Amino acid sequence: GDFEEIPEEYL
Amino acid sequence: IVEGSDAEIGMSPWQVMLFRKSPQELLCGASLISDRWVLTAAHCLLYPPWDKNFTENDLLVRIGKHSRTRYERNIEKISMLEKIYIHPRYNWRENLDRDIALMKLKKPVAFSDYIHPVCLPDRETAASLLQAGYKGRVTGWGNLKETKGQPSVLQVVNLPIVERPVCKDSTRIRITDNMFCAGYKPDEGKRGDACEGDSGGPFVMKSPFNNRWYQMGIVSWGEGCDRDGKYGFYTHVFRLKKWIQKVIDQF
Amino acid sequence: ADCGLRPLFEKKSLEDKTERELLESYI
Ligand SMILES: OC1C(NCCC2CCCCN2)=NCC(Cl)N1CCNCc1csc2ccc(Cl)cc12
C-alpha cells in the first residue's frame, strides 16, 4: 500500500 | 513497538518480515534460526476467528531489513516459502497456547553484515535467563501505539520478564507454561510493549556466559498495547524446542 | 555454530547502545 513495490521476480 | 527507539544498523540481523504478496503489506515479524529456517507465531499464519489461513504461495520472507516500507536494494534478501509447519497442538480456539510455527525457505539465504541467525536456547541457558526482572529485547515494525502510526524503521524495546502470578492476575485469559509475560509495572516508571504487526517477532536475551543472543520468546498476544497493568505475552521457545528440533530433523 | 553473534557488534567487539541494560538486569 504505502510499501515500495518489490522486484517482480519475487512475485 | 510502543515507547521503543530506532534500531541500529545490524542490531537484529535475525529479524525477519513476513510480507503478503497481494496486497503487498507487512503481516508479521519472524526470526532467522538457520540459512533455511524461519521461526514465527502460528497466529500469523492461522487464526480462523479472523478467517486467517495463509498458504506458502501467499507470503514472502524479507531478511536483512531496516526500513519498514522501502525495498532495500543490495541489502535485504527476499525469499519464497517451501513449507509452513504449525504446532499440531496450537490452541487458536482458546488462548493461543503453543503459538509457534516454522517456515522452510525454498533456497538457503546468504549471511551478511545484516543477515545472521539467532541461537535457540538449551535447557541450561533457558533455566538461567528466564527469571523475573531479567530483561530481554523485542523488535519489530508494528504500530507505535494502540490506536505516529507506523515506524519508518525497525523499532527496539527492552522489557523485563514479569513474575507468573502478576502475569496471571493481569488478565482473564488462561495462562499456560508455554507462555511468559514481559513489561514494566505501573509504578516502575519506564514503559514499552509490542503492538499489532510485531507478532511473530523475537524476544531475545544476551547470554552473559558466552555473549551470544538467544531467542527466548515469540511475540504472541496482548490486550491493547502498553496499557498500565497489562503485559505482553510471549511463546516460551525452550518449552516447544523438542517440536522445533523434530521438524528440522525430519524435514 | 556462529548463531547469535552479530557481524556489526559481537564479531567486531562493538556494543550496541542499550545491551548493557540487559546485562545489568541479570543479577
Ligand atoms: O493478541 C491477540 C489477542 N488478544 C486478546 C486476548 C486473547 C484472546 C484470545 C486468545 C488469546 N488472547 N487475541 C487474538 C490474537 Cl490472534 N492476538 C494476536 C494478535 N497480535 C498481537 C498483539 C496485538 S497488541 C499486542 C501487544 C503485546 C503483544 Cl506481546 C502482542 C500484541
**Domain range annotation of chain C:** 1-27
Q: How far is CA B149 from the centre of its chain?
A: 20
CB B150 within 8 A of CB B144: yes
Quoted resolution (Å): 1.8
Residue B22 annotated in active site: no
Choose among C12, C4, C8, C6: nearest CA to B33. Answer: C4
Q: How many CB atoms lie within 10 A of CB B91?
A: 15
- Of the residues C10, C13, C24, C25, the best mutation for testing chain B's interface (the one with the most B CB atoms within 10 Å of its CB) is C25
Contacts of C18 (CB under 8 A, 6+ apart): B5, B137, B156, B158
Contact B244/C at CB under 8 A: no
State the burial class of residue B145 (Cβ atoms within 10 Å of its Cβ: 0-12, 13-18, 19+): middle
Find, among B187, B160, B191, B120, the residue nearest to C26 by Cα: B160
CATH architecture, range B1-12+118-238:
Beta Barrel (2.40)
* Distance (Å) from CA B177 to ligand 1 centroid: 17
Contact B212 C26 (CB under 8 A): no
Atom 12, ligand 1: residue with shortest CA distance = B95
Q: Where in chain B is the domain with CATH 2.40.10.10?
A: 1-12+118-238, 13-117+239-251
- Give me the residue from B10, B205, B214 closest to C8, CB to CB: B10
Rounded to whole angstroms, how far apart are CA atoms B1 and B114?
A: 21
**Is any Cβ of chain A less than 8 angstroms from the Cβ of B71?**
yes
**Cβ separation of B133 and C25 shorter than 8 Å?**
yes
CATH superfamily of C1-27: Thrombin light chain domain (4.10.140.10)
Residue carrying C-alpha cell 524476544: B203
Residues from chain C that touch B8, judged by Cβ atoms under 8 A, are 8, 16-17
CA-to-CA separations, B33 to B98, B196, C11, in angstroms, rounded:
18, 23, 18
B43 part of the active site: yes
DSSP-assigned states of every residue in chain B? -BS-EEPPTTS-TTEEEEEETTTTEEEEEEEE-SSSEEEE-GGGTEEGGGTEE--GGGEEEEES--BSSS--TTT-EEEEEEEEEE-TT-BTTTT-BT--EEEEESSPPPP-SS--PPBPPPHHHHHHH--TT-EEEEEES--SS----S-SB-EEEEEEB--HHHHHHT-SSPP-TTEEEE---GGGS---B--TT-TT-EEEEE-TTT--EEEEEEEEE-SSSS-TT--EEEEEGGGGHHHHHHHHHH-
Give me the CATH topology for the region B13-117+239-251.
Thrombin, subunit H (2.40.10)
**What is the phi/psi pair of residue A3, to 5°?**
-85, 145
The residue contributing the CA closest to ligand 1 atom 14 is: B221
